[PDB]
C-alpha cells in the first residue's frame, strides 16, 4: 500500500443506382421458364448501373472555317472554360493574324481533341463514383462505408475456436 510499492506493483504486472428488373418474382419466373426454354411476357435485362455515355450528340468538331474559306484560300494559294483557358482580347487576335489556312484544319481538330478529352474525363469520374457504389450494394454493404442465418454468415461459422490447454 506504500507509494514506493504502488508504482512498482502495476509495473511488474500490468494487469436508383442499378438497372435490373427490381421485381423479385419476375426474375425467378424468367429462370423457371428459361430452364424449360420458354419466353415470358415481361422483359428482363442484365444488371448494370444507370447512365448513358452519349457522344456525337454533344460537343462536335467546331467550324472555324466559313462556307467557302477553304476553296477561296485554295484559289488565292493559302482558368479553363471547358479545356482551354480564356485568352485576352488583344493577345489572341495577333496570334490569329499569324496563322495560315493550312493550319486551321489542324487547330479545329486540336480543340476538338481537348473538348472530347474533358467531356470524357468528367464522365469517367462520375462513372467511377457510380461503380464504387454498385460494388458495395451488390456485396451486402448498405452504402458508403423470422430470419435464420446460414453458416456463411459473418460470425456464424460451424468451426468453433478451440482453446489451448494452458488457456
Amino acid at each position: 500500500l506504500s507509494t514506493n510499492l504502488i508504482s512498482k506493483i502495476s509495473l511488474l504486472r500490468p494487469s436508383p443506382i442499378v438497372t435490373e428488373q427490381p421485381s423479385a418474382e419476375i426474375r425467378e419466373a424468367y429462370i423457371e421458364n428459361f430452364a424449360k426454354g420458354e419466353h415470358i411476357s415481361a422483359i428482363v435485362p442484365g444488371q448494370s448501373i444507370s447512365g448513358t455515355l452519349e457522344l456525337s450528340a454533344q460537343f462536335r468538331v467546331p467550324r472555324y472555317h466559313s462556307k467557302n474559306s477553304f476553296q477561296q484560300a485554295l484559289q488565292m494559294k493559302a482558368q479553363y472554360y471547358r479545356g482551354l483557358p480564356l485568352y485576352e482580347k488583344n493577345t489572341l487576335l495577333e496570334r490569329l493574324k499569324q496563322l495560315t489556312p493550312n493550319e486551321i484544319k489542324e487547330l479545329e481538330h486540336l480543340h476538338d481533341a481537348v473538348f472530347v478529352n474533358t467531356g470524357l474525363q468528367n464522365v469517367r469520374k462520375v462513372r467511377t463514383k457510380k461503380w464504387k457504389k454498385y460494388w458495395q450494394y451488390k456485396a451486402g454493404i448498405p452504402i458508403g462505408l423470422k430470419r435464420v442465418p446460414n453458416p456463411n454468415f459473418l460470425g456464424n461459422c460451424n468451426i468453433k475456436d478451440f482453446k489451448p490447454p494452458y488457456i
Binding site: K146, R147, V148, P149, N150
Partner: peptide
C-alpha cells in the same frame, strides 16, 4: 433461410 412461424 427464413424459417417462419
Amino acid at each position: 433461410e427464413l424459417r417462419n412461424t
